[PDB]
Each structure stands twice: as structure tokens, then as C-alpha cells.
Homo-oligomer: A and B are copies of this chain.
Amino acid sequence: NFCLWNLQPIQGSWMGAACIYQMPPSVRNTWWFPLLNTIPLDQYTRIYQWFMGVDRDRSGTLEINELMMGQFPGGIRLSPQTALRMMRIFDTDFNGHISFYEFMAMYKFMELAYNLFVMNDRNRSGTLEPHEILPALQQLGFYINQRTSLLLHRLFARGMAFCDLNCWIAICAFAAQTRSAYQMIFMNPYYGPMKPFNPMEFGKFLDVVTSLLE
């Protein structure tokens, strides 16, 4: 339902079966590509309409200041800091621009992360306490240990006691950004033939890397 690594394509997706292979391999081959096939036709049309409207120079890309104008699921408004992390899930060579398919995926990633926060606010307090962060990330497919969980709150909560939607979205941006970093590292053919993605093993990477931000 929420696992980033095995999102089922939906009925009534905006793409027909052959369209998948019309996508450039650049998009096709990415870890986040399955997000695209969970977007229904009407959400696609809406996202497309928006992007064309902000894309005043007709470049086919957004940069961070256009991204921050976005009207995101749950009324999420992006901080500069979080918008940068979000761009960097997709912009892995610091162009400072994302494509339309990358934006589509970012938007659907935000919706999934929103929905997940709401699902986990079982007591309807409107926030997550820091000890609630770990099982929620686990549902998304990020397997971390308790120390990494509590450091994530520290790092991204801007001093607040609990984890509001803004802090959750920053944590999820960082976690996905880190997933793209892992790809970029291990894409390097110096490491030899690439091992398949394993969430348990990735989690150890996320633990070690999160420590470095302290």
C-alpha cells in the first residue's frame, strides 16, 4: 500500500501498456518510475495543466522557485530547504531543473507521504511523536534503527517537540534524496556488477549517512 519499492500500477492509470516503453530509458530505469503508473488519468491532466501554466519560457522543466509555487497534496507548501531536497531526488547532476515526468513523480511521492502521515495520526493529535517516526518510515520502505529515527526528528523539526506534516515531508524528502544518492554511488562501474535493490541493506546505508548530518 505504502511501500515505495513495490507500488502496484493502478487501474485507470494515465498510461496504456505500450506507453511505458515509449518513456525514455532515463526515466524507465529509475527507482521512482513505478510512481508514474500509479497516477490516474484525471490527476495527470491536472498536473500537466499546472506545469504548462508555470513553464512560461516553454523549456519543459521546472526549477526550485517554480516548484515552490506548487499546490501540493494536503496543502503542503515547500520550505526552501525541503524544496532543495525534493529537487535533488531527481536532479542528480545539479542542473537545478527537473523534467515533467520527474515533477509528476515528486507530486505523487508527496501525496503518498501525506497519506501516510494521516494514516499514522491514529490519536488525531495532528502530529507524530518522535517514537512514531520509525514504524511510519518502515511502511514507506525505509528501514532505519531507533537512533536514526530520533536524529531525523532532531535534524528536521526546527526545534519543535513533535513531528508535524512539514517535518515529516522534510524527513521523507531526505530519505528519498538519500535513495537517489545510493543509486548514484553504486551506478559507478568501479564497484562491479550492480546488486539488486535490497531495502534491509539500504537501511544500513541510510543509518550511516544520517549520522553524518549530525
**Which chain A residues have a beta carbon within 8 Å of chain B's beta carbons?**
84, 88, 94, 147, 174, 177-178, 181, 184-185, 188, 190-192, 195, 198, 201, 204-205, 208-209, 211-214
Is the Cβ of A191 less than 8 Å from the Cβ of B190? no
| A147 partner residues in chain B, CB cutoff 8 A | 94
19 A-B pairs whose Cβ atoms sit less than 8 Å apart in the complex: A84-B214, A88-B211, A174-B212, A177-B212, A178-B212, A181-B209, A181-B211, A185-B205, A185-B208, A188-B201, A188-B204, A190-B195, A190-B198, A190-B201, A191-B191, A192-B192, A192-B195, A209-B209, A212-B212
CB distance from A50 to the nearest CB of B (A): 27
| A188 partner residues in chain B, CB cutoff 8 A | 201, 204
| A195 partner residues in chain B, CB cutoff 8 A | 190-192
- Which residue of B has the minimal Cβ distance to A198? B190
Each complex incorporates copies of this chain amounting to: 2
| A181 partner residues in chain B, CB cutoff 8 A | 208-209, 211-212
Contact of A184 (CB < 8 Å), options: B174, B185, B208: B208
> Measured between alpha carbons, how far is A190 from B84 in the docked complex, in Å?
31
- Which residue of B has the minimal Cβ distance to A184? B208
| A204 partner residues in chain B, CB cutoff 8 A | 185, 188
- Which residue of B has the minimal Cβ distance to A147? B94
> Measured between alpha carbons, how far is A190 from B192 in the docked complex, in Å?
13
| A88 partner residues in chain B, CB cutoff 8 A | 211
> Measured between alpha carbons, how far is A180 from B214 in the docked complex, in Å?
15
- Which residue of B has the minimal Cβ distance to A193? B192
> Measured between alpha carbons, how far is A198 from B188 in the docked complex, in Å?
13
> Measured between alpha carbons, how far is A211 from B85 in the docked complex, in Å?
9
| A184 partner residues in chain B, CB cutoff 8 A | 208
CB distance from A186 to the nearest CB of B (A): 8
Is the Cβ of B213 less than 8 Å from the Cβ of A212? yes
> Measured between alpha carbons, how far is A181 from B205 in the docked complex, in Å?
9
> Measured between alpha carbons, how far is A147 from B195 in the docked complex, in Å?
29
> Measured between alpha carbons, how far is A41 from B192 in the docked complex, in Å?
43
